[model samples]
Target: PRVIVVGAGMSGISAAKRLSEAGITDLLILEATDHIGGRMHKTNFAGINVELGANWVEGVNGGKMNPIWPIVNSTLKLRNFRSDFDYLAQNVYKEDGGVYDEDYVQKRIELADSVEEMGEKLSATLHASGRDDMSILAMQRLNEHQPNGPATPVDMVVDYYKFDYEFAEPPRVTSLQNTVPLATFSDFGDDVYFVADQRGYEAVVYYLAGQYLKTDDKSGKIVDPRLQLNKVVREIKYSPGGVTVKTEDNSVYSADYVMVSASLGVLQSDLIQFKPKLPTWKVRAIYQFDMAVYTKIFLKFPRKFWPEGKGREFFLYASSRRGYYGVWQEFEKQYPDANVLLVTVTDEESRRIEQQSDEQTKAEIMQVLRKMFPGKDVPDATDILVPRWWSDRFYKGTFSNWPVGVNRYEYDQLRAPVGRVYFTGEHTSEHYNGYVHGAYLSGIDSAEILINCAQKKMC
Candidate 1:
């Protein structure tokens, strides 16, 4: 079975690995970038291997094994910080020089409760109606769902934890139905484990590829002519018999089957054109889902000016503007000499930071730091590293998510293959979209489907 797989992220690699196991070694992986490990990216910063993209293993529950945990254990010297219970956002600081009071905290707690209750109700209603109507139920609807919405800084900061950190969108455009499930619970568990291994999270994919894809023994380059690099696919012309892909350089390759693992954001941007145009149903489903921007800003300081203790892994900044340097993480516990502080921003803020100069972004973050620690002599960051998932042509955004009022029927259309062309990514996974496991499982699933198709010889 001569099959062509696009993109070298978790999904693409998984598909190639399983195809090899199933004796479909006649395969090609076309990656847009110079290297693999799509969204699961890592690099050296301040003398430590830090993740520029995904940093956490969101679930490690008892009784059941997370599929990705095994891979991590096999490939890398895995060390993870149990971020679930260790995350202490309790040390809340107000912009006006004050700590959050009990009353202020209580209201935010109630808001959290409201989000859970509202989500469950919506889920029940959608299951009963059996319709696919995706309307825009943004975060603004949160106030309407709750009593008086969030009025104070403490109130909004608490909301930020539930809202901005995950979906990467402010309430106004974020889908309530889709976001609720993601916000309230995790299929992996209620905990998150940050990968602290020096090898970095990307090593899992690196080794996985080495097992199946061709690699040069001397230079360690992926030299399987089947796995091409720096080849940007511009057009995909598919017919019942086979599919042909034309790269930016006009190199054409034909395959009996082709699995597209590009991100939903890339699909929506019309970066790759379909020959006959995708069926309206598929194009509609693609547009219905929104792409989220999740940017992690990593800063290296000369010395640790922040607090050092058991419960100091996370802290909150209640600025007049919420989601403005709101969530902060420290890696001193894992790498004591690294002297790193990580901050997260989502959606509009993320896009805004992406456009500005890194120096300007650094200055803005320092201003927020000075406000949070008034008396302490907060020094300028020795170095700063920011990931630009949004601006990158390869990945227009971080992950895919459904909007409010979308039913199961419309989502199913997204997973359906067009003629001989198939799709696989985190977005295609029904249970685990937006997670590394979701992407990996989808790859395996798509490969199985393609294998069956190949055996049947159905055009």
Candidate 2:
């Protein structure tokens, strides 16, 4: 084979497809998991399909096409529901089970909005001046118009909704410079679609694979010999001549070029060792970026107990502990009578919940639910689904986040290839990191870069 694509996620699939389109079809794909989709995963929960990883097709119908939108909407034809992130402010509940004052909530929301606008301006200013980046929290403090950041429980929960839930990290660690023009929104529009297809979001990846891989018409399964599943790559040795990949199963695969589409977390971990070691600049850039953990816990009940209808899809529980089961969404529109509820936690909370047992996590969630509905006969959840992305060896965390202090120089290094080893993933995307579009585009970008070097001798 001429090329070896590591990891069968969106980026890996796109890279392989691009290579095949360019007549570089003599390539092999190695995936750690048995499945094809890396993070765009789904499972049957409460008799309906639910995504365990990426669930949204963020950014649609804007200045430029978000590459993922067509794959989800036209190519695969997956059903999706529009998610209104701002609807979270509509129903805010205190730990005492009482709805927070609407006027107060609005004030906080307005403050957060103003601070975000200020951050945008500040980001542009910093970028123009060639100054170092600062944390979002620092940017918030620079806003004299709204100097005081989130203070009370309501403030904290609102802040969590605005920052942590979006980036999967706190403001103190996130990069304000990168957050303002998150390519998904800046290039595309603010519109987002929640994939509600029973076929699951990974159907897009399957569709891409179907382009170049053989498939069984009867079973609708990909039977291509090039696609190798459950091949956990342990070592990648690359040189000017060629590259070799060693999997944990004791199988060795070699190629003229290898495109590493492993997650930022996996690259950060020791799961895949590079022979001769990566350059210090590459290591520094890798360590400088952050791999955030964003966990979505799914709970099933006998019947719906929470509110439904427009402006009621999302509800918030303002605990004294910020981000402690702070955001929740009901699936009435997506799956009626499914009696399913999704609660999201990020970073530390995600890591903490991943370490504990499901029963214990359920107990804690039950307590929080009881508070959100003090008198409505809240029944116990019949089932629960907790995705442990952080603890997984393939993906040490959910997605890559541009942390404070990392600029274009480090980002270039992160995506820059080392000898014959090329890198591609969400982390390599400068504009769209942490989104599905980022992963998909990075694959194409990296594949083109590798093709030029491997075939055209352009490197």
Best by lDDT: 2
List all candidate RMSDs to the true structure: 2.8, 1.4
Q: What TM-score fits each model?
A: 0.91, 0.97
Off by over 4 Å in 1: 85-89, 102-107, 114-118, 121-125, 128-148, 182-186, 216-221, 457-459
Candidate 1 residue pairs in clash (backbone atoms < 3 Å):
138-171, 138-172, 139-171, 139-172
Model 1, 318-389: lDDT tens digits are 888868888888876778878899999988899999999899999999998888878788999989988988
The lDDT, on a scale of 0 to 1, for candidate 2 is: 0.88
Global lDDT of each model? 0.79, 0.88
Itemize residue pairs with steric clashes in candidate 2.
none
